[PDB]
Amino acid sequence: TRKTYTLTDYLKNTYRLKLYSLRWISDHEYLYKQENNILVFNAEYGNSSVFLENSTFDEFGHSINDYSISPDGQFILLEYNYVKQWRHSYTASYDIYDLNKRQLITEERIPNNTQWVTWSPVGHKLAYVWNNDIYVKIEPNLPSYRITWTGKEDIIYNGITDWVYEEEVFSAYSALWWSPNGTFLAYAQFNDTEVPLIEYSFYSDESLQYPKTVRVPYPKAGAVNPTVKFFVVNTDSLSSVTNATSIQITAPASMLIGDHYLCDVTWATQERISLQWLRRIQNYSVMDICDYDESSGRWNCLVARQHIEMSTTGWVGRFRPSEPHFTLDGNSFYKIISNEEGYRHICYFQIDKKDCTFITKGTWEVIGIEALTSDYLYYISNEYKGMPGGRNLYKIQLSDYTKVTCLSCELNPERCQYYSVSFSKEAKYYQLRCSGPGLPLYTLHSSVNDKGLRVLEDNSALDKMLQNVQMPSKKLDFIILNETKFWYQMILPPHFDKSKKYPLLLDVYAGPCSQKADTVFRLNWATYLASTENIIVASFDGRGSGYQGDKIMHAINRRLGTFEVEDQIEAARQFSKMGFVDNKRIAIWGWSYGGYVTSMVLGSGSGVFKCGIAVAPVSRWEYYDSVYTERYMGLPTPEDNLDHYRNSTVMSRAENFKQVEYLLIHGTADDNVHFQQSAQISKALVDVGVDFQAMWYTDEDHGIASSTAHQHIYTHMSHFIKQCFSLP
Amino acid sequence: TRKTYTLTDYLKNTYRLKLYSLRWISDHEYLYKQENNILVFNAEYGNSSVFLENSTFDEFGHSINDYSISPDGQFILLEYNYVKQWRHSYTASYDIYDLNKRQLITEERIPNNTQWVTWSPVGHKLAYVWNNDIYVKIEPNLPSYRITWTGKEDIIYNGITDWVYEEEVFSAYSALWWSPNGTFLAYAQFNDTEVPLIEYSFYSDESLQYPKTVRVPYPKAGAVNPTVKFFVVNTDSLSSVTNATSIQITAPASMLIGDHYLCDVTWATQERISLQWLRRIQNYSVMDICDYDESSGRWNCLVARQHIEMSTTGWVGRFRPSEPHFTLDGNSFYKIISNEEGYRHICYFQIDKKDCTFITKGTWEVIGIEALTSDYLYYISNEYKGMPGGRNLYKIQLSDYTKVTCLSCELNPERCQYYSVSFSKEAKYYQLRCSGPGLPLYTLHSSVNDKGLRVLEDNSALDKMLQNVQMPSKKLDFIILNETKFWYQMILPPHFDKSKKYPLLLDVYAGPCSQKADTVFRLNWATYLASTENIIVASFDGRGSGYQGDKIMHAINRRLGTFEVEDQIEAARQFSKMGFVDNKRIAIWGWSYGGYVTSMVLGSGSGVFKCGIAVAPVSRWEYYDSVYTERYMGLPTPEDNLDHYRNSTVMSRAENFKQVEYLLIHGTADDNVHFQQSAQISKALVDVGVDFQAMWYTDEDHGIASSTAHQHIYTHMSHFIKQCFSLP
Ligand SMILES: CC#CCn1c(N2CCC[C@@H](N)C2)nc2c1c(=O)nc1n2CCCN1Cc1nc(C)c2ccccc2n1
Ligand SMILES: CC#CCn1c(N2CCC[C@@H](N)C2)nc2c1c(=O)nc1n2CCCN1Cc1nc(C)c2ccccc2n1
Ligand SMILES: *[C@@H]1O[C@H](CO)[C@@H](O[C@@H]2O[C@H](CO)[C@@H](O)[C@H](O)[C@H]2NC(C)=O)[C@H](O)[C@H]1NC(C)=O
Ligand SMILES: *[C@@H]1O[C@H](CO)[C@@H](O[C@@H]2O[C@H](CO)[C@@H](O)[C@H](O)[C@H]2NC(C)=O)[C@H](O)[C@H]1NC(C)=O
Ligand SMILES: *[C@@H]1O[C@H](CO)[C@@H](O[C@@H]2O[C@H](CO)[C@@H](O)[C@H](O)[C@H]2NC(C)=O)[C@H](O)[C@H]1NC(C)=O
Ligand SMILES: *[C@@H]1O[C@H](CO)[C@@H](O[C@@H]2O[C@H](CO)[C@@H](O)[C@H](O)[C@H]2NC(C)=O)[C@H](O)[C@H]1NC(C)=O
Ligand SMILES: *[C@@H]1O[C@H](CO)[C@@H](O[C@@H]2O[C@H](CO)[C@@H](O)[C@H](O)[C@H]2NC(C)=O)[C@H](O)[C@H]1NC(C)=O
Ligand SMILES: *[C@@H]1O[C@H](CO)[C@@H](O[C@@H]2O[C@H](CO)[C@@H](O)[C@H](O)[C@H]2NC(C)=O)[C@H](O)[C@H]1NC(C)=O
Ligand SMILES: *[C@@H]1O[C@H](CO)[C@@H](O[C@@H]2O[C@H](CO)[C@@H](O)[C@H](O)[C@H]2NC(C)=O)[C@H](O)[C@H]1NC(C)=O
Ligand SMILES: *[C@@H]1O[C@H](CO)[C@@H](O)[C@H](O)[C@H]1NC(C)=O
Ligand SMILES: *[C@@H]1O[C@H](CO)[C@@H](O)[C@H](O)[C@H]1NC(C)=O
Ligand SMILES: *[C@@H]1O[C@H](CO)[C@@H](O)[C@H](O)[C@H]1NC(C)=O
Ligand SMILES: *[C@@H]1O[C@H](CO)[C@@H](O)[C@H](O)[C@H]1NC(C)=O
Ligand SMILES: *[C@@H]1O[C@H](CO)[C@@H](O)[C@H](O)[C@H]1NC(C)=O
Ligand code: NA
């Protein structure tokens, strides 16, 4: 008899997905790390040469975290002493190695505790941030030019984001944007002076006698936000004698009237930059297009080149206004925007014209624009077979919009329904990455005639291993609620028998623009629950879910904790009526927004769920950050949306937990969803005399991701679900 | 069939013990509250009158928390706006009511947020502490005189204790002492400038958007301690001089050589005060006896009147050096000290002679000196029947020490074996308070002839109620280990049958000078466990326990987490040897020091215990306060006792927890045993992959005493014990 996929298999990563992570360095070559050696591959033929031997740094004296080869291939940036900060931020030490003279550069080294470093896009200039100030190195062995002098820990951030911009706006620590050929360096400056601090204890190793208090400028909903300024510096006119002059680009008048954000920076040409600004009430955004004036050294943003993007039904963009993709001359661009039917499609803009022309249309959405040439635009969409949870690459002929070709749809329809893509420098080649429903498949293609050059990685080794395991299956289907189709997935146990009743676990996210029903192949906790424990693990995309148009997405506008909560209950009610589901054994679980929805469901008094687990849940919107919360909720003021902020808490539902078994888990050092959120849930449950199970994770953050805490949490949750379902 | 004593009976306090709380106002009268009316009783005859009708403050506008009548009976101090701080400290608002005029005083009111207030011992002067400075009011309606100007929040404390002195030294917030007739006001000043702060989050009501960080000067083991100064001011000079001088009394040279504490303040006469000082290495203490010098206005402490108290085997006193009881003329005093055999007995001293005379002796101990007259000294001891867990009142003739009468031993020997006493102002009457083994019994007696005047409260109403309940019984006995008697108690289920095997729960304290085997009657969680669940709840007093001499008490000197832990394991083995214990169902639990011992036992690898519960445990001695920890452990330095501090942590035993079921509980706002202590236990368990159960209590302190949290904790623990013992 063959083995099942066990909890130890998941926790010890027994069955590994192989990847093929390449780095394009030109229109024809890519870098690939093989056996700690870095190889260069020719895309046309697939032949390679060793670029950097793994032994080169055997005598380095430090464990190298990562490497970054300069665009010209002359230098390599060596990252070490990595110290994680938030989701994207970290500090590290850096050394530069000259690849031509085969030596480490010992002169004018990048300092220790560097916050961010990046090569220019061409050549080998460097820009780095240290102690919140920007520095530029024209040559790796030469002294740095100090760009900013205002940097102050937790107050002034130059060229790096503060907590909320890192997490919610840029999904990055960097706030530096080099011009295409590296002449200019654009940067944002954030000012957190009046932003309140979240404070929490950090216990550290047992040797620390007194716990430390961590203090982070973090704006909760309605609190004072950071302010932002934007600048551009010419790196070709830097002096060792004079301080660098940064030219400020001010936000338009429509933004300066009140609180606002900088939400996108995209260079158009060597002398043209586009910026998008968003109002704090996130349903109005403005793009400025700014040109360098050689005679005055100034950057001018013509009012005739402004582009307004607004929404009457919700917020702008999926999580923020989309990025423009400019043509070679920068006189026009392509951008995904919500059409008049509420579906996100590609619109073609002229820099000086208000009206844009939609180039795609239909009841499906463009996910992202991937590459642009003079003849074609390449994009990913969920058009294929009307499956919102599938993704394919398409190209559209720019001279005739009726000519749309799917490039990935028919490559392997049974194995591959979810693709991402990586194009070479001028789109001569593309790597397709299939992530499901079958095992991931990486292939290389040439754009001229869409030739399928070669298979890069097909996971045939994992396929051989999985043949000896009783693996679960995945069913992707839909239910109809008020004439609308809503999709769900079920992770089904091996040898699934529709005549038998299985316990069911509802795995929830259900936040705005979420998608939990898709064609992706995953090896996770749900795999173990289905394979070993014979539990069906279901997920449902109801109102507020993404990639299906604004009628669905904006259904929860100004109303979090309403329809998306009701829809998870309705899906389980419908699944409970299916002949293969044991209605006495339905559970629910989620992390983050999914933890909030799980808690709201468990306190709804529906009677559908026996038990559930919330991990690091939001419990009250006033506790969460301004950028994410206000995007959907507006402001917690009597004149705006305070009543709904007050009616959407988990704490108000405490009495309804009397009829369920609840497990509440939270890391004590969570800088994102503060431990406070779960501390208020437990206090509300104690106040009404409801018993429940709890677990805190000392010094773990939102990820509960340390090796030992990851193993402990899944072990604890597994015991809980098994007890709930009467499983030995 | 009679009902059992259920968990709801305990939690809802259905079966209530009646008390008889009187307040002596003179040598022959006491105040007592009946139906919210304050009555005044004549002790000789038992007749009463309404002192203050319950209607008096109906139109006050605030709920009155407490009251204090001035010694002269002219005024009443009304306490309201009570806001609890630590174990003893709190702030409140106060109004004074003129009893003669039957009018509330509206001018020169005691300010809001007053920290401490006390009448003088005679008349009606008041001393109070506000914003860490001392003030004196000669008359209730007249302006205050400011005594100190140095008070500073968390830094300088005048007339009030800091955290550590409140908790570990004085067991009181007050640090002021009026002279017997109120002429002088003595006070201590604490300086916490360099004392490190414990910091923790306080979440508050759900309306609070950002958690507050509570910061308290708290010296952990070996950290910088507060410093102390002592002053005496002449309150009779206040209305005559602009700024009356506070005369400092400095500590002796033997104390000034290093860190020290002020540990006792006792006035001897109108012009003589005694002070006891203790070295930071708590095995050396010095008493100074200081006289007012009328010519110089200074206080002088003659070296011929200095008394040294030291210990070669342990620390000085049970928890601190004992207080002296002076004869009327202040030329001699009585004090409890450890004799040559290590038993605490009453010693009689002349103020200027170094050798004292023991007036009691034997293999038993004096617990406290209760009253002293010109002819007799009254004390409580555990002499009766050689039972260390019993307490009786004795009277010794000062002109003939062979004449010792037991005043309470034979009053009701079956019902009453644990007494406390309350004497009238000049010891003319005494109230005896019997607390077990039967129901509490309160009686009044005349000192002139030792006759019983009347029964004040016999708990007959509760006795009638308990007749219809299947109550557990209590066994108090001893086991002989290494030729030493060690006492234990067992709460036995109703209809206890020694031919049956019962599950056993070991209820642990086991700290130095602890006593868990006694004759007190209690209605608590153990009552429910034995009555409803048929669990034997046992407690054992092993090495380190109190009231049995220093050979037992000092056995754990410099070695906490050793013999007292081993002795609890041995006790459970000895209980199994008795034949009525199911060896497969032995559990252990404790709170505070008991929580540390429970955790050390569960991590010992003994195999004796199936499960256990630790509530707010100490986990590492370096995390606990200096005064308590260092008393037994010395300093955590390589030269002193660091090796043992490092060897006695719970965390080092984590791997052994794989053999047991553990439940760890802690209040997040515990200022005493910091949440840090359990946060370090959980992290060590996660690190070795041990599954366990946990529960935090938001904003609860060391007592987990709010009505809702108290009910929640005992409910949670009851489910855990029942699950461990396979009880439905
Ligand atoms: C509070 C909150 C929130 C909303 N939120 C956001 N946004 C946009 C990015 C910045 C962020 N501040 C807010 N992305 C989110 C979520 C979320 O709740 N859950 C997820 N994702 C994306 C990753 C996948 N999941 C779901 C998820 N997340 C975790 C952590 C899981 C852990 C184990 C198993 C499944 C999991 N599934
Ligand atoms: C850490 C530590 C410690 C030692 N400690 C001390 N000393 C002297 C007073 C100042 C203090 N800082 C240190 N008194 C203590 C204890 C203790 O561990 N347990 C107790 N008592 C006295 C009352 C009864 N119990 C046992 C008990 N049993 C229950 C059920 C409790 C419940 C809530 C709070 C305390 C409890 N305590
Ligand atoms: C980064 O940190 C290292 C170590 O602190 C610095 O390297 C030298 O290292 C030794 C100890 O490892 C010290 O005695 C010296 O003070 C260090 N200084 C020099 C100038 O060699 C190193 O210099 C730091 N790097 C930068 C760029 O500041
Ligand atoms: C990158 O682009 C910049 C801006 O277009 C180029 O700088 C200009 O170069 C021409 C020389 O042919 C001069 O006439 C301009 O005055 C320069 N402009 C500025 C703003 O400095 C630059 O040479 C390009 N660099 C590379 C390496 O291609
Ligand atoms: C942006 O959204 C806000 C809030 O929904 C809209 O505000 C108007 O102003 C207040 C709400 O604060 C109400 O009196 C109106 O009913 C709102 N208009 C609506 C709901 O249509 C604001 O109009 C929105 N901006 C755009 C461009 O749609
Ligand atoms: C207890 O009873 C005694 C005696 O009846 C009361 O004492 C006083 O007795 C004298 C006898 O001449 C009466 O004139 C008074 O009525 C009593 N004086 C006062 C000041 O009350 C005594 O009052 C009673 N005590 C209480 C507290 O009611
Ligand atoms: C409380 O103790 C602190 C020291 O812990 C004293 O502060 C010092 O005061 C002197 C003036 O006599 C200064 O020269 C020092 O700079 C201070 N040191 C620190 C560490 O603050 C303080 O004076 C004491 N206060 C009282 C009222 O006794
Ligand atoms: C009362 O007397 C005390 C003791 O002299 C004064 O306290 C001094 O105040 C001054 C500044 O105002 C400081 O320089 C000294 O360090 C203080 N000493 C002590 C021991 O506290 C106090 O200010 C006087 N009050 C009035 C109203 O004069
Ligand atoms: C309380 O005791 C104090 C201290 O003995 C008394 O004050 C002294 O009284 C004598 C007269 O008996 C004078 O010689 C001294 O000058 C006083 N000393 C001080 C320091 O004030 C006081 O009179 C007693 N109070 C009462 C109300 O009896
Ligand atoms: C690949 O092969 C071609 C010749 O056929 C050669 O020009 C080139 O250097 C090779 N590229 C690499 C990256 O090894
Ligand atoms: C940051 O903002 C504050 C106002 O909140 C202003 O005082 C300060 O000058 C700013 N600093 C910089 C460098 O812009
Ligand atoms: C550059 O600016 C900084 C900060 O204001 C100043 O300290 C420094 O003297 C300046 N250097 C020159 C060359 O002007
Ligand atoms: C105490 O506070 C109340 C309300 O703020 C105020 O009306 C009253 O005057 C205060 N009492 C004193 C003695 O300051
Ligand atoms: C006090 O204790 C310390 C540490 O045990 C010791 O070195 C010193 O001799 C002690 N004093 C007495 C009187 O035993
Ligand atoms: Na091919």
Among B236, B245, B293, B299, say which to mutate for ligand 9: greatest number of ligand atoms within 8 Å of CB.
Answer: B236
Of A623, A629, A622, A615, the C-alpha closest to A702 is A615
Alpha helices in B325-476 (DSSP H): 460-466
Instruction: Find residue A312's DSSP bridge partners.
Output: none
**What is d(CA A569, CA A660) in angstroms, rounded to the nearest whole number?**
14
Terminal-to-terminal C-alpha distance of chain B: 20
SS3 call for A649: coil
Nearest ligand 7 atom to alpha carbon B191: 1
Sheet arrangement for strand A429-434? A419-423, A429-434, A441-446, A451-457
Instruction: Report in angstroms the alpha-carbon separations of B653 from A84, B89, B563, B603, B681.
Output: 30, 37, 16, 5, 10
User: Active site residue: B274, B332, B592, B606, which one?
Assistant: B592
Residue A191 CB less than 6 A away from ligand 11: yes
Find the helix or strand (DSSP H, E) in which B388 lies: none
**What is d(CA A435, CA A522) in angstroms, rounded to the nearest whole number?**
9
* Residues near B56 by beta carbon (within 8 Å), at least 6 away in sequence: none
Nearest ligand 10 atom to alpha carbon A39: 13
User: Would strands B126-130 and B176-178 be described as parallel, antiparallel, or unpaired?
Assistant: unpaired
The answer to whether the CB of B117 falls within 8 A of the CB of B67 is no
Concerning whether B670 is annotated as a catalytic residue, the answer is yes
Same domain? B196 vs B214: yes
Q: What angle do CA B711, B713, B669 make, to 5 degrees?
A: 105
DSSP per-residue codes, A200-239: EEE--STT-SS-EEEEEE-PBTTSPPPEEEEEEEEGGG--
A279 to chain B, any CB pair closer than 8 A? The answer is: no
User: Would strands B484-492 and B536-540 be described as parallel, antiparallel, or unpaired?
Assistant: antiparallel
Query: Residue B680 and residue A623: Cβ atoms within 8 Å?
Result: no
Nearest ligand 10 atom to alpha carbon A47: 1
DSSP per-residue codes, B587-640: EEEEETHHHHHHHHHHTS--S--SEEEEES----GGGSBHHHHHHHH--SSTTT
Locate tokens 């930071």: which residue? B280
For A154, the token pair is: 């937790």
**What is d(CA A17, CA A523) in angstroms, rounded to the nearest whole number?**
9
The answer to whether the CB of B391 falls within 8 A of the CB of B378 is no
**What is d(CA B99, CA B684) in angstroms, rounded to the nearest whole number?**
62
Of B490, B466, B464, B370, the C-alpha closest to B419 is B370
| CATH code at position A30 | 2.140.10.30
**What is d(CA B445, CA B431) in angstroms, rounded to the nearest whole number?**
6
Same domain? B200 vs B277: yes
Same domain? B365 vs B228: yes
Experimental method: X-ray
B496 to chain A, any CB pair closer than 8 A? The answer is: no
Residue A228 CB less than 6 A away from ligand 11: no
Instruction: Report in angstroms the alpha-carbon separations of A634 from A280, A496, A650, B690.
Output: 9, 46, 19, 44
Same domain? B122 vs B259: yes
Q: What angle do CA A421, A423, A429 make, to 5 degrees?
A: 115
* Residues near B454 by beta carbon (within 8 Å), at least 6 away in sequence: B46, B443, B444
Instruction: Find residue A416's DSSP bridge partners.
Output: A437
Same domain? B21 vs B6: no
Q: How crowded is residue A479: how many other Cβ atoms within 10 Å of its Cβ?
A: 16
**What is d(CA B51, CA A659) in angstroms, rounded to the nearest whole number?**
53
Instruction: Find residue B310's DSSP bridge partners.
Output: B284
Cross-chain CB nearest to B698 (options A223, A683, A711): A683
Question: C-alpha dihedral over A39, A42, A47, A52, to 10 degrees?
Answer: -20
**What is d(CA A48, CA A425) in angstroms, rounded to the nearest whole number?**
18
**What is d(CA B677, CA B687) in angstroms, rounded to the nearest whole number?**
16
For A639, the token pair is: 């004149």
* Residues near A375 by beta carbon (within 8 Å), at least 6 away in sequence: A397, A398, A399
Name the CA radius of gyration of chain A, rounded. Answer: 26
Of A218, A299, A219, A295, the C-alpha closest to A251 is A299
DSSP per-residue codes, B114-140: EEEEEE-SSTT-EEEEETTEEEEESST
Dist. CA A88 → ligand 1 center (Å): 15
Same domain? A388 vs A534: no
Locate tokens 């058009």: which residue? A383
The answer to whether the CB of B503 falls within 8 A of the CB of B531 is no
Alpha helices in A217-358 (DSSP H): 253-256
Same domain? B437 vs B542: no
Find the helix or strand (DSSP H, E) in which A715 lies: helix A707-724
* Residues near A59 by beta carbon (within 8 Å), at least 6 away in sequence: none
What sign has the CA pseudo-torsion A188, A193, A197, A201?
positive
Q: Crossing angle for the helix pair B563-576 and B593-602, nearest 10 degrees? A: 70
**What is d(CA B200, CA A224) in angstroms, rounded to the nearest whole number?**
24
Ligand nearest to the CA of A128: 3
Among A315, A509, A678, A697, say which to mutate for ligand 1: greatest number of ligand atoms within 8 Å of CB.
Answer: A509
**What is d(CA B480, CA B488) in angstroms, rounded to the nearest whole number?**
11
Pocket of ligand 3 (CB under 6 A): A 93, 109, 111-112
Of B510, B523, B529, the C-alpha closest to B721 is B529
Q: What angle do CA B229, B195, B172 make, to 5 degrees?
A: 55
Q: How crowded is residue A566: how many other Cβ atoms within 10 Å of its Cβ?
A: 17
Buried b (16+ CB within 10 A) or exposed e, A15-45: eeeeebebebbeebbbbbeeeeebbbbebee
Residues of A with a catalytic annotation lie at 592, 670, 702
Dist. CA A95 → ligand 15 center (Å): 40
Q: Residue A70 carries which DSSP code?
A: -
Among A120, A125, A185, A236, say which to mutate for ligand 4: greatest number of ligand atoms within 8 Å of CB.
Answer: A236
Cross-chain CB nearest to A680 (options B196, B203, B712): B203
What sign has the CA pseudo-torsion B369, B373, B374, B375?
negative
Query: Residue A206 and residue B649: Cβ atoms within 8 Å?
Result: yes
Alpha carbon B603 to chain centroid, angstroms: 30
A687 to chain B, any CB pair closer than 8 A? The answer is: yes
Beta-strand ranges (E) seen in B19-105 are 23-24, 29-34, 37-42, 48-52, 66-69, 75-84, 90-98, 103-104
Backbone angles phi, psi at B571, to 5 degrees: -55, -45
Same domain? A418 vs A494: no
Domain boundary among B437, B459, B481: B459
Concerning whether B445 is annotated as a catalytic residue, the answer is no
Query: Residue B668 and residue A679: Cβ atoms within 8 Å?
Result: yes
**What is d(CA B535, CA B527) in angstroms, rounded to the nearest whole number?**
10
Residues in chain A: 728
Bond into B437 cis (ω within 30): yes
SS3 call for B100: coil
**What is d(CA A245, CA A248) in angstroms, rounded to the nearest whole number?**
10
Long-range contacts of A287-296 (CB under 8 A, 24+ apart): A287/A321, A287/A324, A288/A249, A288/A251, A288/A252, A289/A351, A290/A249, A292/A184, A292/A232
* Residues near A430 by beta carbon (within 8 Å), at least 6 away in sequence: A371, A378, A393, A421, A422, A423, A424, A444, A445, A447
Query: Residue A691 and residue B668: Cβ atoms within 8 Å?
Result: no
Find chain A residues with C-beta within 8 A of B636's C-beta.
none
Q: What angle do CA A403, A409, A412 make, to 5 degrees?
A: 150
Buried b (16+ CB within 10 A) or exposed e, A169-186: bbebbbbbbbbbebbbbb
The answer to whether the CB of A587 falls within 8 A of the CB of A506 is yes
For A603, the token pair is: 């306190």
For B146, the token pair is: 């400011």
Cross-chain CB nearest to B220 (options A210, A697, A709): A210
Cross-chain CB nearest to B682 (options A679, A689, A696): A696
Pocket of ligand 14 (CB under 6 A): B 281, 283-284, 310, 312, 634
Q: How crowded is residue B100: how many other Cβ atoms within 10 Å of its Cβ?
A: 8
Of A496, A493, A495, A500, the C-alpha closest to A472 is A493
Residue A48 CB less than 6 A away from ligand 10: yes
Instruction: Find residue B394's DSSP bridge partners.
Output: B379, B406
Same domain? B292 vs B433: yes
Question: C-alpha dihedral over A406, A411, A415, A420, to 10 degrees?
Answer: -50
Domain span at B713: 1-13+468-728
Categorise residue A689: left if φ over 0, alpha if ψ from -120 to 50, beta otherwise: left
Name the CA radius of gyration of chain B, rounded. Answer: 26
Domain boundary among A459, A485, A508: A459
Helix, strand, coil shares, percent, chain B, to 5: 20, 40, 45
Among A133, A146, A147, A149, say which to mutate for ligand 12: greatest number of ligand atoms within 8 Å of CB.
Answer: A149
Find the helix or strand (DSSP H, E) in which B72 lies: none
Find the helix or strand (DSSP H, E) in which A530 lies: helix A525-531
SS3 call for A286: strand
SS3 call for A19: coil
Cross-chain CB nearest to B694 (options A687, A694, A719): A694
**What is d(CA A471, CA A463) in angstroms, rounded to the nearest whole number?**
11
For B394, the token pair is: 């004795």
Find chain B residues with C-beta within 8 A of A676's C-beta.
201, 203, 211
For A727, the token pair is: 């499983």
Instruction: Report in angstroms the alpha-carbon separations of A489 from A486, A566, A588, B32, B337.
Output: 11, 18, 14, 72, 78
Q: Which B-chain residues 189-228 have CB contacts (< 8 A) with chain A?
A: 196-201, 203, 206, 209-211, 213, 220, 223
| CATH code at position B535 | 3.40.50.1820
**What is d(CA B620, CA B629) in angstroms, rounded to the nearest whole number?**
10
The answer to whether the CB of A425 falls within 8 A of the CB of A412 is no
Q: How crowded is residue A230: how many other Cβ atoms within 10 Å of its Cβ?
A: 24
The answer to whether the CB of A167 falls within 8 A of the CB of A179 is no
**What is d(CA B320, CA B324) in angstroms, rounded to the nearest whole number?**
12
**What is d(CA B600, CA B651) in angstroms, rounded to the nearest whole number?**
9
**What is d(CA A164, CA A627) in angstroms, rounded to the nearest whole number?**
7
Instruction: Report in angstroms the alpha-carbon separations of B49 from A306, A439, B19, B100.
Output: 89, 92, 20, 16
B683 to chain A, any CB pair closer than 8 A? The answer is: yes
Query: Residue A199 and residue B213: Cβ atoms within 8 Å?
Result: yes
**What is d(CA A505, CA A308) in angstroms, rounded to the nearest whole number?**
44
Same domain? B9 vs B21: no
**What is d(CA B147, CA A150) in angstroms, rounded to the nearest whole number?**
49
Ligand nearest to the CA of A148: 12
Q: Count interface pairs A-B at CB distance under 8 A.
A: 119
Atom 8 of ligand 8, residue of closest alpha carbon: B149
* Residues near A643 by beta carbon (within 8 Å), at least 6 away in sequence: none
Dist. CA A673 → ligand 5 center (Å): 28
Same domain? B447 vs B546: no
Q: State the total domains in chain A.
A: 2
**What is d(CA A198, CA A194) in angstroms, rounded to the nearest whole number?**
13
Dist. CA A92 → ligand 3 center (Å): 14
* Residues near B680 by beta carbon (within 8 Å), at least 6 away in sequence: A203, A206, A698, B619, B620, B623, B651
User: Would strands A22-24 and A184-191 be described as parallel, antiparallel, or unpaired?
Assistant: unpaired
Terminal-to-terminal C-alpha distance of chain A: 20
The answer to whether the CB of B697 falls within 8 A of the CB of B675 is no
**What is d(CA A662, CA A613) in angstroms, rounded to the nearest whole number?**
6
Domain boundary among B459, B484, B502: B459
Same domain? A6 vs A85: no
Categorise residue B212: left if φ over 0, alpha if ψ from -120 to 50, beta otherwise: beta
Bond into A437 cis (ω within 30): yes
B311 to chain A, any CB pair closer than 8 A? The answer is: no
Find chain B residues with C-beta within 8 A of A695's C-beta.
694
B12 to chain A, any CB pair closer than 8 A? The answer is: no
Instruction: Report in angstroms the alpha-carbon separations of B348 from B327, B332, B333, B377.
Output: 10, 7, 6, 11
The answer to whether the CB of A601 falls within 8 A of the CB of A568 is yes
Instruction: Report in angstroms the alpha-carbon separations of A396 from A335, A390, A403, B114.
Output: 14, 19, 6, 78
Backbone angles phi, psi at B112, to 5 degrees: -70, 155
Of B89, B97, B77, B154, the C-alpha closest to B115 is B89
Amino acid type, A601: V
SS3 call for B337: strand
Q: How crowded is residue B76: how many other Cβ atoms within 10 Å of its Cβ?
A: 21
Q: What angle do CA B448, B450, B451 make, to 5 degrees?
A: 105
**What is d(CA B356, CA B348) in angstroms, rounded to the nearest whole number?**
5
